[PDB]
């Protein structure tokens, strides 16, 4: 789940990833 998840979030994704996993 993480690897494709990881991915989509460099990707695409980091604005959710850094407030999800606490790097904002």
Known sequence: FLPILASLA????PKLFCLVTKKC
């Open 10 to 13: 460099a990707k695409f994704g």
